[PDB]
Design a protein around this ligand. Structure first.
Ligand code: SF4
Ligand code: SF4
Ligand code: FCO
Ligand code: FCO
Ligand code: SF3
Ligand code: SF3
Ligand code: F3S
Ligand code: F3S
Ligand code: CL
Ligand code: CL
Ligand code: CL
Ligand code: CL
Ligand code: MG
Ligand code: MG
Ligand code: NI
Ligand code: NI
Lengths: 581, 264, 581, 264
C-alpha cells in the first residue's frame, strides 16, 4: 500500500477495499472504489468512467454546420446543451453573429433544460438516497397532510391523497415485485426523515415523474422534439410569423401561448414542491452540511452562461456569472479565458489515452483523443477487473485542470462564484436558505449544499424563463422577428482556417467545445464537459478531483451498503456519457 | 395479478431512449412502472447499486428465466476486448449475452440498439455493433429513432401487454404500426413539396410560411417513423414542424449519408 | 284576469306580473313571466322560447347521409346528440345495421357528452344559484380546507390553495371589474352556504372550467373535433388499425391510450369533486327538496338510450331504461312507441306556428313547421313585448304531449323511471343518497332532486365510459376491427320511399328525430327535443308543461330578484336552441 | 391595471363558439376571463338575469362607450320584423345595433356571425343575415368555422391584448395568421392525394392506412382554416385525421355547395 498527501488529504490505500460497480441512478457507466480504515472512514477514493464512444474522433472531417447534431448525442439527459455549445463554437470560429431572437430562444432552451434536469435529478436520481420509500408505508396520512401544509401552499395535500398514494405503494409491493425498490438500503441508520416526510417525498417523486414531461414541451415548440431538439449555425430554425399569411407554418401566437402556459406551470411546481422538499431534506439531515465538502471550499469554477446581450459573451452580458476561485480564496474571483493555453488543460497520465508526454497537460486546441485501454497491474485481469490500479491508468475520463488546479464545477460552484462576485439575487437567496436552516454559509460547501444549490438554481432558471419570454415578446411587438443570420451559411464564405470556443453552464457545470475548421471541414473538435471535471482521475502531481475529494474522510455506517458514497456522488448529478464522450 | 418482468440494460448510449420513455403522456411512465409491467432491473432508476444491484440482476434473471422481456438501450463495443463499455469489471457484452439468454424476447430501443447510431458513425472508434449482430437466437423488435417517440414507446409496450404478443414487424424487425410509412408520406408540408415551394435559406419568406424543407436537406423522403402523424411530446411538434428538416434519425447509417443539409 | 284549474294547480293571472328576459346561464334565448299573489307566491308561470331557426325546413331536400351534419348544429352544448339521433333515424329508414365497434364508439360519444354536459351545467350554469361567490371573500382558508377534506379525498385542498383562490378573487373584484359577477344576487337570503363552502365551491367552479376541456378529447379522437364532431350513416369514420402498416393513419394503440387516460381522469374528477359538491348543496339546502316538484310527481318520460346490443333498441339492449309514468302512478311504468300516432303529438295552439287545425296534435310523421309570429295583444306592439299573452300564442316552442299528457323529461325523469322499473343499481344509489341527506324518497321530486340526479348520472356515465372502452378493446383483441357498413351507402340501394325514427336520451332528456325519405332525399324531418317537452307552452286543454308547473306555487323572498325562478329553471338545464331548432 | 371591457352578445346560434372558447388550452379560458379581459356581459355565463342583466348591459355600453370590444356569436334574422330572435321583448337586431354603436371594434365569432351558417342555408326561413350586412360603420374581424378552433379563438384574443391592435386580415376580414392558407395546403394526407391514393368507401383498406378523403367529398382544397396545422382540442385531432373529409365549415355558403360526400 501507499500513502501520500494532496490538497489537505491523506490518500491511503491500505486497508479494506470496497467496490461499487455499477453506480446506479446516474447517467451512463461509472465504477467507484474506496479504501476504508478500521473506523469505517474512507481514506482513498477512485472515480472511474467505464464507457467511451469517441465523438471527438467521429467529428473529424464533418461539415461544421452538422456538428451540433452529432455532439448533441453526447448525452440525452443534458439534451440540448452540447448543441448550444457547438453552434456557439462554430459561430465563434467563422465570425457569425445571430439575431437577438435566436439568442433569446437559445437562452429559453437552456433555462428549460436547467429546470427539467434539476427537477428530475432531485426526485428520480437522488431522492431515494434521502427518502426511505418503504418507511412511507408506516406514515399516518393526516400527519402527512399536516406536514405538507406546514411547508407549502401546494394544493395537493389532502389526507385522502396521501392515503391513496400510500395504498398505491402498498399494492405495488404486495406481490413481492418491488421493482426499482428491490434490495435497496431501506432502514439504514442514515435515513432520518420521519414516516410522514417519507410519504410526502414519495408522493412528490410521483408528481415530479409525471410533471417533468410537460417542461420539455418548450423544447418541442422551438426545437421540434425532446430529447434531442434541433438547432442551426446562425440562429434557430424556428422561423416566427405572428400576423401574416402562413403563420400556421411558423412560431405563431398560439405556439407562444403554449410556451407561456408551460413556463407558469414549471415555476409553480419548482417553487411549491421542489423548493420546500429540498429545505425539508436540509432540516432533517443537517449533519450532511459538514460531509462531502471536497474541493468546494478550495477550488471552484464557472465559465458563465446566458448572454443577455446577443453575441456578447463578456461579464456585462452573462446572467450567470463566470469565474474561478483557487486556494480557498473566495475573496479573489479570477477571470477565465478559454483560449489561454495556461488555463484549461487536460492530463491523461491516469486515463486510458496516449499523449506524446503524459506528464504535461494539453489545452483543448492542442487536444488529442487517442484511446488506449491499459489498466496495468489490476487485481484480476484486463477483462475482469477486481480492483483498478489508481497508481496508473484507471478511467476513460481525461483529467482537466485550471492553471494546474483541480476544480469543482456545477450548481454549488456557480452559487459560490456568484455569491462572492456580489450578485444580489444569489446573495439574497443563499442567505435566506441558510437562515431558514440555522446554518452558517460554510454549510453550503457540502453534499447537502449541492442539493440545496440545485433547488435554488431550478427556481432561478424558472424565473429567467419568464424574463426571456418577455424579452422575445417585446421584440415581436417592435417588429423584430429575425431568427437566423445566413450571410455566412455557405462554406465558401468561411475563413480557410479558423478556430473557435463555445462555452456555457450545463446543469452539471462548466462546458466547453473547442473547434478548428480548415478547408470547410472540422480539423479538430475537443470537448471538456462538467462531469469530466468532477469525475476526473488524478494528475501527475497526484492531485485528486472533485468526486474523489468529496468522498475522502467519509464515515460509513455499514461498509457493505454504500449509502453514504451514493449520497455524495449523486449530489453532483454524475453524467458519465457526458464525461467521456 | 403479477406483472410481466422486464430487465432494462444499457450499453454505449446517451440515455435518450430512457428519457423519451419517461416523457410518455398516455400511459404515464409512472403508470407503466406501477401497473403494467414489473421493471425489475434498470441502472438509471433503481435504488440498489453495486453488489446489491448485481444481486437483483442475478435474482431476476434466475427466478424468471425464460419469462422476462429484455429491453436494451445502447450497444456493445467490440474494440479493446469490449472494455470500451465495462459493467461490474467485465465487458458489457457479457452482461448482454447473459441477459439475452434468459429472455423471452428483446426490445432494441433506439437507433443505438437497432443499428449503431452516433458511436458507429465513421470511423467507429469503438467498433460499436448493434444487438442483432451479437444476439442471433432471440426475437428482437427494433424500435429505432434517436430517440424513438415517447408515446410510440409506450404504445408498443401497451400493445404487448394488452394483446399478449409481439407487434407485427417489417423485414427489418420494426413494428409495422409506427414504422410502416415514410415521414414524407404523412408530412403536412407535402403540398409545398408538390408545388415546388421550398425554403432556400433559413428564415426566408418561405420559411415563415412553413414551406417544404427538401432543399435544406430534409431526409423525410427516405425515413420511416411516426413523427409526422403521431408527432412528439404529446402531439406538440416534430422536427419539420419547428422548421428543421428530418435528419433521418430512424434509419440505419443516417449519420454517414452526407451532410444533413445536402438534398436527399 | 282569469283563473282555471289544471293538473292540480290553480292558474291565476291576477296580481303583480314579473318578467325575466333574458334568462341567463342557459343555452339560447328564453323569456319567463310570472304572476305573484299578495304573499309573493307564484300563481302563474309562462315559459317562452325567444328564438327560432328552422332546421326542419332546411333539412328538406338534403341527402339523408348529410342530415347528421346539419342537425348537429341544432346545438353546440349538447353537441353530438342530434348527429347520433340522425344517423339512427336514417339507418332505421333505410334498413342499415352498423358493426359492433361503431355502436360501441357511438355509446362512448354519448357517455362523453353526458359527462361533459352535466359537469359544465353543475358549475358554470347552475352553480352561482347556490354558491355566493362574493361571500367566499369572507372565508377562513383553514376552515375551507377542513371542510373540503371532510367531504372528499380530492387532493387539492390545502389552506394555501384556498387562500390563493380567494386572493385571486379579491384582486379580480378590487378594481370594480366584476365581469360575470356584476349585479348578481349575492347576499340574497336564499344563499345558505357558510363562507367556507362558498370558497370551496368557487375553487371547484374554476377547476371544472379548466378540466372540462379534457373530457372532449375523446370526441376529438373518434370524431375529429369538439364542438361538433363527425359521424357517418353506417357507423363511424374513424377506421381502426392496430398492428398493420399505416396505423399512423388510423385509430391505433396510441390513440386508444389517449382515450383511456381521459376516461380515468374524468371519472376521478366527477367522483371526487362534483359528487361531494352536489351532496353538500343538498345538505345545506334541504328545503329545496320540497320546492319545484312540478310534473315530477305526476308525469315523467324516458325513451331510453345506450343500446348495448348493436342495432337492437329494445328493452333488453338499452342500458338507460325507457318508459312513461302518468297520473302519478309510479307502479305502472308504461311502454313508449315512437311510431304510434296516439303517443307523441305536438300542439301549436299556444305557439307561433300554423296548423290547418290548431286544436289537434300532430305526431311528428305528420308534423308541420310553418312559422307564424302572432303574439296578439301583448302590452306593447309586435316588436315590443311588454307582457306575453298566454291566452294565445306565446312561444317559438311547440307543445309535445304523450297520450295527451304533459310530461317532464331529463335526469330526474330517467331516474324515476329506472327506479320504478326496479333497476337494482338505481334503486340502491337513490336510496343511499336520500338516506345520506336524511330525506324521504319524495324529496328527489324537486328542484334539489334534479341537481342530485344530474350528478348521479355524471357518475353513471363515467362508469359506462370504461365499460364501453373495455368492450371495444375486447373486440380488437378478437380481431374485430370493423367500424362501418357500406352495403347501403349508395342511394341506388335504398327504398324509393321509407321512414324511420332515431331516439336517445340526451343530457336534458328524451330526444327523437323522425325522418321520411323519398327519391333519395329528405321529404320530412321533424325533431322533438328534450327542452321542447320541458319548456312547452300550453295545449288546447290548458295543460301546463314542466317548467311552468315547477315554478307554480313558489315563494319569492324578493320579487325584483328572481333567484328562486332561476334556481328551478336552471335545474332542468334549459337548452333553448334545442327546444326550437 | 384595468382589463379591456368586452361585451359578448348572442343572436340566432347554437352556442358552439362559446363552447369552443371555453375549450382553450393556452391560455385557459379561466385565465382569459380573470387576467386578460373584463368579460362584462355574456348571457351564457353571467350571474345576473332579466332586469339585472339589462342594467349591466346599459351600464357597460354607457360607461365604456367607444372603448369596449363587442364579441358577437350568431346572427340577426330579418324575418317577422326581427322577432325570430327576441331580446328583452324586442328584436335582437336592436340590441346588436346598440352594442355595435359604442364598440371600438367587433369580433364576429364563427360562421354564423361571419356569413350565416346553418340557419342561412336554403331556404333561410328566418332571413338570417351576417353581422357585416347590418353593421356597416365598424371594424369587424371575421373568425369563421363551425365553430372556430378553441386555441385560434384564444390566440386571436391574446394577440389583440398583447399587441394592442386588430389582426391583419384578408379581403374577407379573416385574420391572415390562421386563415391565410387552405386546409389542403397543410394536410398530412396530401402525399396520398398526389399519389392517387384515395379512400373509396368507408373502412376500406385505404381508410385504415389514412389515405386521402377527396373521393369521399373532402372540401379541404377550397377551405381556409388552421385545422390541419394547429389542429383541434390541444392538438389532439382534426376532422380529416379522424377519417371524415372537411365539410368546408369555415367558408361562406358551405351548407349549399352540394352534398358533403360529393367531390370538390
Ligand atoms: S418537409 Fe421533408 S418530409 Fe415534409 S414534404 Fe418536404 S421533404 Fe417531405
Ligand atoms: S384529405 Fe382533404 S385536405 Fe387532405 S389531401 Fe386529401 S383532399 Fe386535401
Ligand atoms: N449537464 C450536463 Fe452534461 C455533463 N456533465 C453536459 O454538458
Ligand atoms: N341535452 C340536450 Fe339538447 C336539449 N334539450 C338535445 O337533444
Ligand atoms: Fe436513446 S441512446 Fe441516445 S444516441 Fe441515438 S439512439 Fe442512442
Ligand atoms: Fe358557434 S354558433 Fe354554432 S352554428 Fe355554425 S358557427 Fe354558429
Ligand atoms: S430526424 Fe428523427 S425524430 Fe423523426 S422527423 Fe426525422 S425521424
Ligand atoms: S369541416 Fe371545419 S373544422 Fe376544419 S377541417 Fe374543415 S374547416
Ligand atoms: Cl446495464
Ligand atoms: Cl446507425
Ligand atoms: Cl345577447
Ligand atoms: Cl354560411
Ligand atoms: Mg474531451
Ligand atoms: Mg320540432
Ligand atoms: Ni449529460
Ligand atoms: Ni342543446
Amino acid at each position: 500500500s501507499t500513502q501520500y498527501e494532496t490538497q489537505g488529504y491523506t490518500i491511503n490505500n491500505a486497508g479494506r477495499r470496497l467496490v461499487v460497480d455499477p453506480i446506479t441512478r446516474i447517467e451512463g457507466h461509472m465504477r467507484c472504489e474506496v479504501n476504508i480504515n478500521d473506523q469505517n472512514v474512507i481514506t482513498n477514493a477512485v472515480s472511474c468512467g467505464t464507457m467511451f464512444r469517441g465523438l471527438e474522433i467521429i467529428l473529424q472531417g464533418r461539415d461544421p454546420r452538422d456538428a451540433w447534431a452529432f455532439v448533441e448525442r453526447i448525452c440525452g439527459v443534458c439534451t440540448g446543451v452540447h448543441a448550444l455549445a457547438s453552434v456557439y463554437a462554430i459561430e465563434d470560429a467563422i465570425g457569425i453573429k445571430v439575431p437577438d431572437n435566436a439568442n433569446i430562444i437559445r437562452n429559453i432552451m437552456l433555462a428549460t433544460l436547467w429546470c427539467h434536469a434539476h427537477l428530475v435529478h432531485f426526485y428520480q436520481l437522488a431522492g431515494m438516497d434521502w427518502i426511505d420509500v418503504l418507511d412511507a408505508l408506516k406514515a399516518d396520512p393526516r400527519k402527512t397532510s399536516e406536514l405538507a401544509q406546514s411547508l407549502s401552499s401546494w394544493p395537493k395535500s389532502s389526507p385522502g391523497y396521501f392515503f391513496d398514494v400510500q395504498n398505491r405503494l402498498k399494492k405495488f409491493v404486495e406481490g413481492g415485485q418491488l421493482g426499482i425498490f428491490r434490495n435497496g438500503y431501506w432502514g439504514h441508520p442514515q435515513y432520518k426523515l420521519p414516516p410522514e416526510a417519507n410519504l410526502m417525498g414519495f408522493a412528490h417523486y410521483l408528481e415530479a415523474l409525471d410533471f417533468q414531461r410537460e417542461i420539455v414541451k418548450i423544447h418541442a415548440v422551438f426545437g421540434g422534439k425532446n430529447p434531442h431538439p434541433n438547432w442551426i449555425v446562425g440562429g434557430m430554425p424556428c422561423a416566427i410569423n405572428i400576423d401574416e399569411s402562413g403563420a400556421v407554418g411558423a412560431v405563431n401566437m398560439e405556439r407562444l401561448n403554449l410556451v407561456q402556459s408551460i413556463i407558469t406551470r414549471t415555476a409553480d411546481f419548482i417553487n411549491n414542491v421542489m423548493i420546500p422538499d429540498a429545505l425539508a431534506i436540509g432540516q432533517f439531515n443537517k449533519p450532511w452540511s459538514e460531509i462531502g465538502t471536497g474541493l468546494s471550499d478550495k477550488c471552484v469554477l464557472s465559465y458563465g452562461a446566458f448572454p443577455d446581450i446577443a453575441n456578447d459573451f463578456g461579464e456585462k452580458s452573462l446572467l450567470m456569472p463566470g469565474g474561478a476561485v483557487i486556494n480557498g480564496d473566495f475573496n479573489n474571483v479570477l477571470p477565465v479565458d478559454l483560449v489561454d493555453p495556461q488555463q484549461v488543460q487536460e492530463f491523461v497520465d491516469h486515463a486510458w489515452y496516449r499523449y506524446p508526454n503524459d506528464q504535461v497537460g494539453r489545452h483543448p486546441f492542442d487536444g488529442i483523443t487517442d484511446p488506449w485501454y491499459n489498466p496495468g497491474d489490476v487485481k484480476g485481469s484486463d477483462t475482469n477487473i477486481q480492483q483498478l490500479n489508481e497508481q496508473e491508468r484507471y478511467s476513460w475520463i481525461k483529467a482537466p485542470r485550471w492553471r494546474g488546479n483541480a476544480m469543482e464545477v456545477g450548481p454549488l460552484a456557480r452559487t459560490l462564484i456568484a455569491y462572492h462576485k456580489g450578485d444580489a439575487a444569489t446573495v439574497e437567496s443563499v442567505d435566506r436558505m441558510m437562515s431558514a436552516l440555522n446554518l452558517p454559509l460554510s454549510g453550503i460547501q457540502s453534499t447537502l449544499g449541492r442539493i440545496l444549490c440545485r433547488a435554488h438554481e431550478a427556481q432561478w432558471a424558472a424565473g429567467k424563463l419568464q424574463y426571456f419570454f418577455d424579452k422575445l415578446m417585446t421584440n415581436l411587438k417592435n417588429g423584430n422577428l429575425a431568427t437566423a443570420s445566413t450571410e455566412k451559411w455557405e462554406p465558401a464564405t468561411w475563413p480557410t482556417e479558423c478556430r473557435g470556443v463555445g462555452f456555457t453552464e450545463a446543469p452539471r457545470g462548466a462546458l466547453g467545445h473547442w473547434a478548428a475548421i480548415r478547408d470547410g471541414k472540422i480539423d479538430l473538435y475537443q470537448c471538456v464537459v462538467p462531469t469530466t471535471w468532477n469525475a476526473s482521475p488524478r494528475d501527475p502531481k497526484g492531485q485528486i478531483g472533485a468526486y474523489e475529494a468529496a468522498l475522502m474522510n467519509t464515515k460509513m455506517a455499514i461498509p457493505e451498503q454504500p449509502l453514504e458514497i451514493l449520497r455524495t456522488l449523486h449530489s453532483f448529478d454524475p453524467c458519465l456519457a457526458c464525461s467521456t464522450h | 395479478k403479477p406483472r410481466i418482468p422486464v430487465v432494462w440494460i444499457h450499453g454505449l448510449e446517451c440515455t435518450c431512449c430512457t428519457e423519451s420513455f419517461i416523457r410518455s403522456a398516455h400511459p404515464l411512465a409512472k403508470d407503466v412502472i406501477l401497473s403494467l409491467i414489473s421493471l425489475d432491473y434498470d441502472d438509471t432508476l433503481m435504488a440498489a447499486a453495486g453488489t446489491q444491484a448485481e444481486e437483483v440482476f442475478e435474482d431476476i434473471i434466475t427466478q424468471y428465466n425464460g419469462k422476462y422481456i429484455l429491453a436494451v438501450e445502447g450497444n456493445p463495443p467490440l474494440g479493446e476486448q469490449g472494455m470500451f463499455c465495462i459493467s461490474s469489471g467485465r465487458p458489457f457484452i457479457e452482461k448482454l449475452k447473459r441477459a439475452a439468454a434468459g429472455a423471452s424476447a428483446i426490445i432494441a430501443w433506439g437507433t443505438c440498439a437497432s443499428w449503431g447510431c452516433v458511436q458507429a458513425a465513421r470511423p467507429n472508434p469503438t467498433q460499436a455493433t448493434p444487438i442483432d449482430k451479437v444476439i442471433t437466437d432471440k426475437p428482437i423488435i427494433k424500435v429505432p429513432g434517436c430517440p424513438p417517440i415517447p408515446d410510440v414507446m409506450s404504445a408498443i409496450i401497451t400493445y404487448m401487454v394488452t394483446f399478449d404478443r409481439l407487434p407485427d414487424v417489417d423485414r427489418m424487425g420494426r413494428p409495422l404500426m409506427f414504422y410502416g410509412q415514410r415521414i414524407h408520406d404523412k408530412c403536412y408540408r407535402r403540398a409545398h413539396f408538390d408545388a415546388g415551394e421550398f425554403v432556400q435559406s433559413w428564415d426566408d419568406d418561405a420559411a415563415r410560411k412553413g414551406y417544404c424543407l427538401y432543399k435544406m436537406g430534409c431526409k423525410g423522403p427516405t425515413t420511416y417513423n411516426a413523427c409526422s402523424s403521431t408527432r412528439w411530446n404529446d402531439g406538440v411538434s416534430f422536427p419539420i414542424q419547428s422548421g428543421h428538416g428530418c435528419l433521418g434519425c430512424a434509419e440505419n447509417g443516417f449519420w454517414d449519408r452526407g451532410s444533413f443539409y445536402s438534398r436527399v
